[PDB]
Write a structure and sequence with these properties.
six-stranded mixed beta sheet; six-stranded antiparallel beta sheet; CHP03684; PUA; Nuclear Transport Factor 2, Chain: A; binds potassium ion; alpha+beta; about 40% strand; 2 domains; Archaeosine Trna-guanine Transglycosylase, Chain: A, domain 4
Length: about 190
């Protein structure tokens, strides 16, 4: 019925199961952007709508865990809670970042090339990737590669300037705070 999240505040909730049509559509829309769809064929998928003081948020829950969201580009992205639940191996790529970059990303910055200390997986410009703090492998941001993985390998090694990854969702953003609270309530 309602939750109260940090930053976002009071949210009035409505939840429902995805229809069979909605489920098939979701799977079709995920397939091109990820190595694997992380959840089981038998997972329970629900759509949660949360209305706060500023507007409406929509999250797809996977067995109750707030995992997926539609962005303004019309593509479906994982929450950081999804990456905790399912790991990161199912993404096309991961970018490892230094401490200064991890902190900046947690504040809401895009990821710049000099903050990159490694690249895992193979991906092209435009692909969905996650940025992880190298030391602990903590996911801090989910976003869109601005360069190919092979290009980024040479660019970070020379500490070239420019944007490596365009941020879509990050640790401590409004969606993150909402997802935290949905997860807390599930517990
Ligand atoms: K799967």
């Amino acid at each position: 019925h309602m939750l109260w999240a940090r930053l976002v505040g009071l949210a009035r909730l409505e939840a429902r199961a995805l229809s069979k049509k909605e489920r098939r559509s979701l799977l079709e829309r995920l397939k091109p952007y990820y190595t694997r769809i992380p959840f089981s064929e038998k997972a329970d998928l629900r759509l949660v709508k949360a209305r706060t003081d500023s507007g409406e948020y929509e999250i797809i829950t996977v067995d109750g865990v707030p995992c997926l969201f539609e962005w303004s580009d019309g593509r479906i992205y994982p929450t950081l809670q999804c990456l905790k639940a399912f790991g990161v191996d199912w993404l096309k790529g991961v970018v490892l970042v230094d401490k200064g970059a991890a902190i900046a990303l947690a504040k809401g910055a895009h990821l710049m090339i000099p903050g990159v200390v490694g690249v895992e997986g193979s991906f092209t410009r435009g692909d969905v990737v996650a940025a992880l703090y190298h030391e602990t492998r903590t996911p801090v941001m989910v976003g869109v590669a601005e360069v190919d993985s092979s290009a980024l390998e040479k660019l970070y090694r020379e500490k070239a300037r420019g944007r490596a990854v365009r941020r879509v969702h990050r640790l401590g953003d409004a969606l993150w705070e909402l997802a935290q609270e949905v997860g807390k309530r599930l517990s």
